[PDB]
């Protein structure tokens, strides 16, 4: 999981297929789109967009 | 009320309200319901002025109607066309003679204009108007019967002092 | 290490055999410590004499009624349970109550042996009818506390011996409570109100003194472990 | 963290706070996976404000979409796809807990799914189109921190979720013994911790900063904001949890924030709790606490407040801050510095001077009494009037910081302001009677009493319980999850060992291999909707390890015998005893106590003013007037409506009579009537009084 | 009848006092007027004006005038004429 | 009494404290005393403790739905920041100690202090003015205490054993002190049946006639077959009260308290309720009531009911597919089937739980809760409501003990959100009706003793019925009680029972029933002929005091408040703006 | 008959600081109350010594850090609260702790004056880096129970002193149980076994003797009735 991750045995029986996404992504991605950051451009073009604005 | 006398309709209303409240587990004594209902049969509608000056179909206090039909009439208790009316909570509370209390929950301008044109005076008998004036309410300890109580020591006890 | 200030003990006499004691002001939290211990000591640490068994003449198997007396055997047992007896024997003794003819028979009719004293002669025992007779023997011995009926399950060689619960303790009913009080502008101190009812044998003051002495002797054992050690003292009241 | 990811339904172009009743604030069947349907404010904004779910990201267009697992031919595959609500209405999605085969095929025939209308139905295994990513796909971050959430009622879950955001940071935090898997992530994503940027070795550690040397030779230095005031007054500070020479990987937590331990959120404390009524001191949701919590600072917190005052130019001159103050002794200002500001580190109570300040007065015109009085004393008139900043009533603490801005040094002060002074006062608030205290399952209560250690019931080994919760309040509120938390917390505190030597018991056949045996003080996780089952917990309760003496305190039923601390007799029946995680809310008594005798009065209405905790007055509504009239309490109503409000003439007479010992005079006529009379006369109405 | 000893502002019992007045309101006015008289007697004028006599019962250490008036009423040491 | 924090009391009583300080030479003048108080010097607290004595203070908890929301208490200084409130008055204030706050007001004038001391004192407001039913009575834990104390359980230690041949009676005690001694030794149980010779408790009427037909007095010993707990409980009641010897259910406690208020002075009632509170707390501390999942028992019959009703639902679905049902009727049939299933599961749970289980013991004793909550906790949640307001045909099988699944929890959240939104809008119409009622009845007051009217209304106390044995009418409590007879009760038995002007109380109604008279004429406010307002005789006894109403009583305000206070408890018209008009579905 | 054997007390050691005492015989129903009385006395009224206040060289208040120290002042105070000390004179005495350079600081490094002892030298206080220098003075005086901090507003101390809470109780844990003991002709009397674990300041038997003396002094009131 994470580097530190203090040992905490879990009672879960199911398997997690998808890790929890960045909790603060809603507040950051919108602003990255507003200012057109380079990483935002890479993410948008990789999604299947051409000449994103 | 049309079929039977005024007493019967009051009993019917009390029974209906008490049944409504009791069917849901709420317990209230019948006397409170009776007190609430009594205010709905305090006015008598006057059809024609036979022993008064009240306009046709005008709501008048029962005591005033009785006094007018009893005393001022020279020929004795000449009847004046008038029958009891059931008029509900809203109109019963709205038909008060105290303009000071009426202006509390009615259009203030209309009430004030009607009072000024009529030049009628409000006697401070009640709770709504007295609190506005700052006078102590005419209920409980505030009535003249108890307010004017005079307290002095007994002659024997005073002598013992 | 000295206490904030010395507590005091006072008494008020509700009746001849009942009294209420007030101990205060105590350090906070000590009211509960003292109360239950004092109550238990008073109830179960004052030796006394009481009837531990009875035998009724003429009846040995049908313990419901006895001829010639208008009181059931249970009523006689309950009456005898209330007898006040003081003794210095340390050995069980036998007392006799014999009466014939109709009328009331009370405790005064008993004839105690040497060393046995009865404090409530007026206590009502039974009422005999015409031709009725009552011949009952009581076993009296000393003990502490309330000992339930010791049965004859393994001692069947004795016939007709009715065991009865014995209230050895001269103290009958004791209650206590703790109340909050303020001293030195702080409202944490405790006042202990202990109400004591006792038999006719001894006054409540003497019973309280005996309980206090017993508790002091008991805690002397703990004190003897290491004397001269740190311990909050109470100091003298007058000087 | 919850605030940042919030979905408001109001503002510019939104809905009014007084509109849309029970029509837009209802839980639509489309919240599932895109908006938490349980956690929402209970105030005016119920339903209008919610929180985004754990697995959700906004579509570039602006539509909240959630992930789902692609299902083809009845086998679940790793082809996660993010769909919107309308995209989901054309498919049939199944639960995440539906059993599946090792390969991935469905083991059952009828599977529970959701239809296009938002209705739950049982369908064939082949009809399944998609599947949820995980059971906790509908709950938010705040709601996912509540263990055994499936056993709590919706209302209680909402209360607990909204209460978890009101926990004040404690002096020493501790992670919960029993929790979910959200404690870690929520701590790291909140940003209240310091995480190493790149792999390296800790160069040095101090209480103020951390230095780390990366594998590339690039140094990194992290400042640790220490004793920093939060917007709401709580102390926010970080302390390092690393030492020199420690290898640290990227993303590792090197420092922890206010409510984090070892990187996990630690909003509260684990306390030994016994479920039983106690002499009525916990009657009506009240809570009894042990004095130990006070002595050992278990529930102590730091509270910092800022007092600001400005000095500006005025038409009579520029008011200056000075150590010298007129008409005041020199002992009160013994703690002031050279320039008239309280020294740092000084202790201040109510009414203490924080910074001296004087203003030009102007016309004096002393009365003859004052003239003679100051002639005998000889103290000549002073042109200035004292206006120094004073500590508000009810507040105390130590000065921990002072900030000064001035136009003399080109600071950007507002127009006309010459200087500005801010003083920070910090205090060490311990737990006390009346402070609210609650768990994570909506169980809340004020502290009715704090018994000494010896009084509290204690276990046979001599351990005194830390808290007592009334039994009557649990079953009614329908929040049985707290009992499960208590049992599992006890199981975690004392390690357990299942008799797996002869074969896994029937109840333990589901436990993962790693969970068969654990030592004491272990921390376990019970994820929401995928946590420990009741049977497994019951089985574990019967396998707890002994104590130092070698005996088990809690039997197989989760109950233990308790000795009475006051009488000493053991209680007649065993009671439930365990460990519960409880947290201190911000609703403290010190901030919720008010009182008035005489103070400021309104300028227009001449009534006492309110809205502030210093000298705010209480409102006497019309319903209270009705109650007084029903009582027949004529005199009390008059005295309360005139003497104590907008009766300027009689108010001073009442004060004088009270101070002089004279009997109170009869009330006059309130201003509310004279003003009304004058106004109604102003409208050309000849209103007159007569006898 | 055989009630336990009242304590606080319950002494004397309200039921016994009520029997000595027309109603609760009359008793309230009775007690208030008597308390005003006691307070005026304490303050008086310095000249020893006897327009209002002092407490006919023995006062306590710091008993309030109202409590003294209620005790006097319970002791049948006063009388009043209703203002009807 | 009530506990008032030190700082709050000082702030409220500042001027009095300043006067006292100046009087005691602690301060030279007003300004010095003011400075001393504001600085809070040590001398202030000594003066405050004395000035506050015998000074009533009003406590209020808004909203003030009825006059008992404001009550006077005698304050006592306590360190801290929280006001200590008596546990009994909570129901009157409708407050719980989980964050609620109270407002404190200080009377100043002598009239106001007398008003608070007499009229508004809490000890004088035990009964509810609405109906006269006692309002300051044991609640929750206390009810669990007094109940547990008075329960009788077979097989208890030290149980009384009937005498046989060569076997006398064993469980017989000379006095309650001996029983206490035996219990302290572990030989007897507080709930074990025994025979005890009581000498200070008055025997019941039948036993008193059997044994003391000339009158019982203290010191007359009588043997009572009862439990030690019941004997201790009866020691709390006044010495003149007959022995009860019954299990103290909430209804039984209410009956006992109501009878006590009817016969004895109110001060005795206050003392008795204080004693009952103390005993209830003490015996609930050690009543063994606790919550654990070993105590939450799940009936074994639940699965069979669920399977059978699921089969019935499958049949309903099949018939719907056949076209014999439309959608709405299918949903209605499924809803009825599942409601029947829920009722059956609840009945099975009720018949499965042992009588001594804490969860069912709490509900059965009347302390709190209801069997529906127990079914939800251990049975099945049942049907839940969609946001539109209609029952979802598929119910929730899982119990909260088992743990609701994701979909069940999501569908359950709808009703929770709906109710939490509805709870506030519920009060709007109640307040509207209350303010109508008070406005119309604002100025109805009792102005004179009697109007001297011969009119009234006819009421019926009971009915003979088919068998001829008279059965009480369930409406007599709120109809005939608290009325004044219009005419003498001479219509039956050929002799008087009670003449005109007699107020019909519990003893009066009991005597009337034994006389075989059903119909009686009672004066009513409707038939009063007073010139203004109403008269005391027509109104009847005041439910708050239990005696004839006093002149000047504000009857109108009390009536309006009593009518309006329970308004929120009634069913109310739908709040859904969208949908269809709710008038038809009255 | 009434038994003559009066109660007697025996002791048995379990560890260096835990002892179990057996009192027997006792009358029925007497073990629990006596054990609870002893427990309350031991946990409430056993005098001891504790640190009342501290003064660090470079800090004016407790809401600040010391350069070169990993822990802040509040953490240092919390660690010091765990210190156990013994004192011989009632009046306050001063101890000094001084260290510099890298390394940890333990209670053993504290310098106690004559008549003052520290029983847990291994207790940790703080840790210092190369540029760290820790200097502090501690005031120790005797008392009983728990006493909160004393404000400098009343104590008259100059700015810089940091009062700390004092926990004078040396006892750590106490519990008791009761069993049945046989005396001639009966088998229903109480034997009390009470175990006490105390901090290293004093031995368990010393605490028990102190509690017994306090209880004797308190219960002498009833005996004074004569
Ligand atoms: Zn009438």
UniProtKB/Swiss-Prot annotation, chain C:
GO molecular function: DNA binding; DNA-directed RNA polymerase activity; protein dimerization activity
The name this protein goes by in its record: DNA-directed RNA polymerase subunit alpha
Encoding gene (name): rpoA
EC number: 2.7.7.6
Region annotated Alpha N-terminal domain (alpha-NTD), chain positions: 1-226
Organism for this UniProt entry: Mycolicibacterium smegmatis (strain ATCC 700084 / mc(2)155) (Mycobacterium smegmatis)
Domain comment quoted from the record: The N-terminal domain is essential for RNAP assembly and basal transcription, whereas the C-terminal domain is involved in interaction with transcriptional regulators and with upstream promoter elements.
GO CC terms of this entry: cytoplasm; DNA-directed RNA polymerase complex
Family: Belongs to the RNA polymerase alpha chain family.
Catalyzed reaction equations: RNA(n) + a ribonucleoside 5'-triphosphate = RNA(n+1) + diphosphate
Gene Ontology biological process terms in this record: DNA-templated transcription
Summary of subunit composition and partner proteins: Homodimer. The RNAP catalytic core consists of 2 alpha, 1 beta, 1 beta' and 1 omega subunit. When a sigma factor is associated with the core the holoenzyme is formed, which can initiate transcription.
Enzyme class: transferase
Function of the molecule: DNA-dependent RNA polymerase catalyzes the transcription of DNA into RNA using the four ribonucleoside triphosphates as substrates.
Keywords annotated in UniProt: DNA-directed RNA polymerase, Nucleotidyltransferase, Transcription, Transferase
Swiss-Prot record, chain D:
Effect of residue 10 to P: Rifampicin (Rif) resistant
Keyword Transcription: yes
Effect caused by changing residue 8 to L/P/W: Rifampicin (Rif) resistant; RbpA no longer rescues transcription in the presence of Rif, decreased affinity for Rif, no change in affinity for RbpA; tested in the Leu mutation
Enzyme Commission number: 2.7.7.6
Entry keyword set: Antibiotic resistance, DNA-directed RNA polymerase, Nucleotidyltransferase, Transcription, Transferase
Molecular function as annotated in GO: DNA binding; DNA-directed RNA polymerase activity; ribonucleoside binding
Top EC class, one word: transferase
Keyword Phosphoprotein tagged: no
Chemical reaction(s) catalysed: RNA(n) + a ribonucleoside 5'-triphosphate = RNA(n+1) + diphosphate
Any one of the GO CC terms: DNA-directed RNA polymerase complex
Similarity comment text for this entry: Belongs to the RNA polymerase beta chain family.
General function of this protein: DNA-dependent RNA polymerase catalyzes the transcription of DNA into RNA using the four ribonucleoside triphosphates as substrates. This subunit often mutates to generate rifampicin (Rif) resistance. Interaction with RbpA partially restores Rif-inhibited transcription; once the subunit is Rif-resistant however RbpA no longer stimulates transcription.
Further remark: Mutations in the RRDR sequence (residues 423-449) confer rifampicin (Rif) resistance. Rif blocks transcription initiation but not elongation.
The protein's name in its UniProt record: DNA-directed RNA polymerase subunit beta
Organism: Mycolicibacterium smegmatis (strain ATCC 700084 / mc(2)155)
Swiss-Prot record, chain E:
The keyword Hydrolase is annotated on this UniProt entry: no
Alphabetic keyword roster: DNA-directed RNA polymerase, Nucleotidyltransferase, Transcription, Transferase
Catalytic reactions of this protein: RNA(n) + a ribonucleoside 5'-triphosphate = RNA(n+1) + diphosphate
GO cellular component terms listed in the entry, alphabetical order: DNA-directed RNA polymerase complex
GO biological process, one term: DNA-templated transcription
Gene Ontology molecular function, alphabetical: DNA binding; DNA-directed RNA polymerase activity
Taxonomy, superkingdom: Bacteria
Enzyme Commission number: 2.7.7.6
Keyword field contains Transcription: yes
Function description: Promotes RNA polymerase assembly. Latches the N- and C-terminal regions of the beta' subunit thereby facilitating its interaction with the beta and alpha subunits.
Quaternary organization: The RNAP catalytic core consists of 2 alpha, 1 beta, 1 beta' and 1 omega subunit. When a sigma factor is associated with the core the holoenzyme is formed, which can initiate transcription.
Record-stated family: Belongs to the RNA polymerase subunit omega family.
The protein's name in its UniProt record: DNA-directed RNA polymerase subunit omega
Record gene name: rpoZ
Residues of the full protein shown: 24 to 107 of 107
UniProtKB/Swiss-Prot annotation, chain F:
Complete-protein stretch covered: 440 to 1025 of 1317
Encoding gene, per UniProt annotation: rpoC
Protein name per the record: DNA-directed RNA polymerase subunit beta'
Function: DNA-dependent RNA polymerase catalyzes the transcription of DNA into RNA using the four ribonucleoside triphosphates as substrates.
Homology family: Belongs to the RNA polymerase beta' chain family.
Annotated Mg(2+) binding sites: 96, 98, 100
Binding site for Zn(2+) 2: 451, 528, 535, 538
Assembly description: The RNAP catalytic core consists of 2 alpha, 1 beta, 1 beta' and 1 omega subunit. When a sigma factor is associated with the core the holoenzyme is formed, which can initiate transcription.
Cysteine pairings via disulfide bonds: none
């Amino acid at each position: 999981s994470v580097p530190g991750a203090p040992n905490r045995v879990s009672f879960a029986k199911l398997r997690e297929p998808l890790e929890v996404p960045g909790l603060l992504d809603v507040q950051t991605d919108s602003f990255e789109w507003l200012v057109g950051s380079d990483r935002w451009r890479q993410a948008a073009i990789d999604r299947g967009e051409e000449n994103p604005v | 009320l049309r079929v039977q006398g005024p007493r019967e309709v009051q009993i019917h209303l009390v029974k209906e309200v008490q049944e409504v409240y009791r069917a849901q587990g709420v317990s209230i004594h019948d006397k409170h319901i009776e007190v609430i209902v009594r205010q709905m049969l305090r006015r008598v509608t006057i059809i024609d002025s036979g022993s008064t000056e009240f306009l046709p179909g005008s709501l008048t206090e029962r005591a005033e109607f009785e006094a007018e039909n009893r005393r001022v009439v020279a020929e004795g208790g000449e009847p004046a066309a008038g029958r009891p009316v059931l008029m509900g909570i809203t109109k019963a509370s709205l038909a008060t003679d105290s303009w000071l209390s009426a202006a509390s929950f009615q259009e203030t301008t209309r009430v004030l204009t009607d009072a000024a044109i009529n030049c009628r005076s409000d006697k401070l008998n009640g709770l709504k108007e007295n609190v506005i004036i700052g006078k102590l309410i005419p209920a409980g300890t505030g009535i003249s019967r108890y307010r004017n109580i005079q307290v002095q020591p007994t002659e024997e006890a005073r002598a013992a002092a | 290490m000295l206490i904030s200030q010395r507590p005091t003990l006072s008494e008020e006499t509700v009746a001849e055999n009942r009294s209420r004691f007030v101990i205060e002001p105590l350090e906070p939290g000590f009211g509960y410590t003292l109360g239950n211990s004092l109550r238990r000591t008073l109830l179960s640490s004052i030796p006394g004499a009481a009837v531990t068994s009875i035998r009724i003449d003429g009846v040995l198997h049908e313990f419901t009624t006895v001829p010639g007396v208008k009181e059931d055997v249970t009523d006689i047992i309950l009456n005898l349970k209330g007898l006040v007896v003081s003794s210095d024997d340390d050995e069980p003794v036998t007392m006799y109550l014999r009466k014939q003819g109709p009328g009331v028979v009370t405790a005064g009719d008993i004839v105690p042996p040497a060393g046995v004293t009865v404090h409530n002669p007026d206590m009502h025992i039974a009422t005999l009818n015409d031709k009725g007779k009552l011949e009952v023997e009581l076993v009296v011995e000393r003990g502490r506390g309330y000992v339930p009926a010791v049965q004859n399950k393994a001692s069947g060689a004795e016939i007709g011996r009715i065991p009865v619960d014995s209230i050895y303790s001269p103290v009958l009913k004791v209650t206590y409570k703790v109340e909050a009080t303020r001293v030195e502008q702080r409202t944490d101190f405790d006042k202990l109100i202990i109400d004591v009812e006792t038999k006719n044998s001894i006054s409540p003051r003497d019973a309280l003194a005996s309980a206090g002495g017993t508790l002091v002797e008991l805690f002397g054992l703990a004190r003897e472990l290491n004397a001269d050690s740190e311990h909050i003292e109470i100091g003298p009241s007058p000087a | 963290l919850t605030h940042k990811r919030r979905l408001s339904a109001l503002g510019p172009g939104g809905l009014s706070r007084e509109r849309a009743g029970l029509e837009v604030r209802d839980v639509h069947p489309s919240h599932y996976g895109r908006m938490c349907p349980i956690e929402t404010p209970e105030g005016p904004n119920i339903g209008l404000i919610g929180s985004l779910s754990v697995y959700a990201r906004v579509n570039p267009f602006g539509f909240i979409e959630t992930p789902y697992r692609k299902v083809e031919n009845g086998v679940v595959t790793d082809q996660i796809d993010y769909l919107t609500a309308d995209e989901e209405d054309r498919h049939v999605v199944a639960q995440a807990n539906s059993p599946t085969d090792e390969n991935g095929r469905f083991t059952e025939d009828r599977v529970m799914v959701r239809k296009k209308g938002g209705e739950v139905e049982f369908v064939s295994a082949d009809q399944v189109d998609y599947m949820d990513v995980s059971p906790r796909q509908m709950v938010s971050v705040a709601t996912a921190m509540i263990p055994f959430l499936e056993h709590d009622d919706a209302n209680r879950a909402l209360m607990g979720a909204n209460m978890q955001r009101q926990a004040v940071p404690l002096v020493r935090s501790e992670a919960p013994l029993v929790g979910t898997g959200m404690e870690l992530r929520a701590a790291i994503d909140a940003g209240d911790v310091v995480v190493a940027d790149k792999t390296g070795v800790i160069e040095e550690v101090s209480a103020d900063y951390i230095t780390v040397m990366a594998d590339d030779g690039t140094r990194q230095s992290y400042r640790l904001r220490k004793f920093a005031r939060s917007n709401h007054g709580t102390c926010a500070n970080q302390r390092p949890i690393v030492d020199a020479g420690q290898r640290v990987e990227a993303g590792q937590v090197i420092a922890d924030g206010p409510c984090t331990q070892n990187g996990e959120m630690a909003l509260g404390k684990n306390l030994l709790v016994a479920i039983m009524p106690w002499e009525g001191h916990n009657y009506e949701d009240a809570i009894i606490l042990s004095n130990r919590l006070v002595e050992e600072d278990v529930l102590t917190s730091i509270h910092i407040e800022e007092h600001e005052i400005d000095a500006r130019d005025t038409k009579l001159g520029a008011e200056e801050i000075t150590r010298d103050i007129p008409n005041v002794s020199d002992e009160v200002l013994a703690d002031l510095d050279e320039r008239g500001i309280v020294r740092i580190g000084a202790e201040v109570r109510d009414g203490d001077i924080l910074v001296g300040k004087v203003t030009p007065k102007g016309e004096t015109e002393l009365t003859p009494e004052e003239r003679l009085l100051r002639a005998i004393f000889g103290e000549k008139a002073r042109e200035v009037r004292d206006t120094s900043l004073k500590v508000p009533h009810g507040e105390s603490g130590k000065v921990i910081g002072i900030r000064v801005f001035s136009r003399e040094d080109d600071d950007e002060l507002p127009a006309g302001v010459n200087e500005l002074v801010r003083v920070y006062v910090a205090q060490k608030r311990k737990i006390s009677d009346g402070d609210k205290l609650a768990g994570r399952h909506g169980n809340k209560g004020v502290i009715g009493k704090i018994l000494p250690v010896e009084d509290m019931p204690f276990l046979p080994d001599g351990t005194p319980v830390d808290i007592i919760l009334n039994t009557h309040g649990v079953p009614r509120r329908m929040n049985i999850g707290q009992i499960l938390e208590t049992h599992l917390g006890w199981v975690a505190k004392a390690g357990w060992n299942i008799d797996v030597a002869a074969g896994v018991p029937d109840w333990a056949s589901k436990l993962p291999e790693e969970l068969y045996s654990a030592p004491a003080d272990s921390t376990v996780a019970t994820p929401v909707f995928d946590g420990a089952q009741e049977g497994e917990l019951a089985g574990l309760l019967g396998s707890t390890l002994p104590n130092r003496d070698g005996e088990v305190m809690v039997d197989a039923d989760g109950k233990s015998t308790l000795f009475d601390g006051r009488s000493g007799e053991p209680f007649p029946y065993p009671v439930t005893v365990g460990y519960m995680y409880i947290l201190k809310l911000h609703h403290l008594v010190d901030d919720k106590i008010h009182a008035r005798s005489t103070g400021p009065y309104s300028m227009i209405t001449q009534q006492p003013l309110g809205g502030k905790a210093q000298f705010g007055g209480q409102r006497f509504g019309e319903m209270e007037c009705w109650a007084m009239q029903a009582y027949g309490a004529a005199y009390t109503l008059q005295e309360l409506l005139t003497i104590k409000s907008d009766d300027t003439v009689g108010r001073v007479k009442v004060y004088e009579a009270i101070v002089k010992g004279e009997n109170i005079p009869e009330p006059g006529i309130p201003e509310s009537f004279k003003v009304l009379l004058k106004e109604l006369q102003s409208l050309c109405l000849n209103v007159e009084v007569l006898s | 009848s055989a009630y336990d000893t009242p304590l606080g502002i319950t002494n004397p019992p309200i039921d016994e006092l009520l029997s000595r007045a027309s109603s609760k309101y009359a008793l309230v006015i009775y007690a208030a007027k008597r308390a005003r008289q006691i307070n005026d007697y304490y303050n008086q004028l310095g000249d020893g004006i006897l327009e209002y006599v002092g407490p006919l019962v023995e006062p306590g250490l710091q008993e309030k005038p109202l409590s003294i008036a209620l005790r006097e009423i319970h002791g049948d040491l006063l009388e009043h004429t209703e203002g009807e | 009494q009530c506990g008032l924090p030190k700082l709050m009391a000082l702030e409220l009583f500042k001027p009095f404290v300043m006067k006292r300080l100046v009087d005691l030479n602690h301060a030279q003048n007003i300004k010095s005393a003011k400075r001393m108080v504001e600085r809070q010097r040590p001398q202030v607290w000594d003066v405050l403790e004395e000035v506050i004595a015998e000074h009533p203070v009003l406590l209020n908890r808004a909203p003030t739905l009825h006059r008992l929301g404001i009550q006077a208490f005698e304050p006592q200084l306590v360190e801290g920041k929280a006001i200590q409130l008596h546990p009994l008055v909570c129901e009157a204030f409708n407050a719980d100690f989980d964050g609620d706050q109270m407002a404190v007001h200080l009377p100043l004038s002598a009239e106001a202090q007398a008003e608070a001391r007499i009229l508004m004192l809490s000890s004088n407001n035990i009964l509810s003015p609405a109906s006269g039913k006692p309002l300051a009575m044991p609640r929750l834990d206390m009810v669990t205490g007094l109940y547990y104390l008075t329960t009788l359980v077979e097989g208890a230690t030290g149980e009384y054993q009937a005498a046989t041949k060569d076997a006398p009676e064993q469980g017989v005690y000379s006095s309650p002190a001996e029983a206490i001694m035996a219990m302290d030794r572990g030989a007897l149980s507080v709930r074990a049946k025994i025979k005890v010779r009581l000498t200070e408790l008055r025997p019941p009427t039948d036993l008193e006639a059997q044994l003391f037909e000339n009158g019982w007095k203290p010191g007359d010993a009588w043997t009572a077959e009862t439990t030690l707990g019941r004997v201790m409980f009866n020691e709390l009641l006044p010495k003149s009260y007959p022995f009860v010897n019954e299990q103290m259910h909430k209804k039984v406690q209410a009956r006992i308290i109501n009878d006590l208020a009817e016969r004895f002075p109110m001060i005795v009632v206050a003392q008795t309720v204080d004693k009952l509170k103390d005993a209830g707390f003490y015996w609930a501390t050690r009543s063994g009531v606790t919550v654990s999942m070993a105590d939450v028992l799940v009936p074994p019959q639940k699965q069979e009911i669920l399977e059978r009703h699921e089969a019935e639902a499958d049949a309903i679905e099949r018939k719907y597919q056949r076209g014999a049902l439309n959608h709405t009727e299918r949903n209605e049939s499924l809803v009825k089937i599942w409601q029947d299933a829920t009722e059956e599961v609840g009945k099975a749970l009720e018949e499965f739980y042992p009588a001594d289980n804490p969860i069912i013991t709490i509900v059965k004793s009347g302390a709190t809760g209801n069997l529906t909550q127990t079914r939800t906790l251990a049975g099945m949640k049942g049907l839940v409501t969609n946001p539109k307001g209609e029952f979802i045909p598929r119910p929730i099988k899982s119990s909260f003990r088992e743990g609701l699944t994701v979909l069940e929890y999501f569908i359950n959240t709808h009703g929770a959100r709906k109710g939490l939104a509805d709870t506030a809008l519920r009060t709007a119409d109640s307040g509207y009706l209350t303010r109508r009622l008070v406005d119309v009845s604002q100025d109805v007051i009792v102005r004179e003793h009697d109007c001297e009217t011969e009119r009234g209304i006819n009421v019926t106390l009971a009915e003979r019925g088919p068998d001829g044995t008279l059965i009480r009418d369930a409406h007599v409590e709120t109809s005939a009680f608290a009325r004044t007879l219009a005419t003498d009760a001479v219509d039956a038995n050929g002799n008087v029972i009670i003449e005109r002007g007699h107020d019909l109380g519990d003893p009066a109604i009991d005597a009337l029933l034994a006389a075989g008279i059903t119909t009686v004429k009672v004066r009513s406010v409707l038939t009063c002929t007073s010139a203004t307002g109403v008269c005391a005789m027509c109104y009847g006894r005041s439910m708050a005091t239990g005696k004839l109403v006093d002149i000047g009583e504000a009857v109108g305000i009390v009536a309006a408040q009593s009518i309006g206070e329970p308004g929120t408890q009634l069913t109310m018209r739908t709040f859904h703006q969208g949908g269809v008009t709710g008038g038809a579905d009255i």
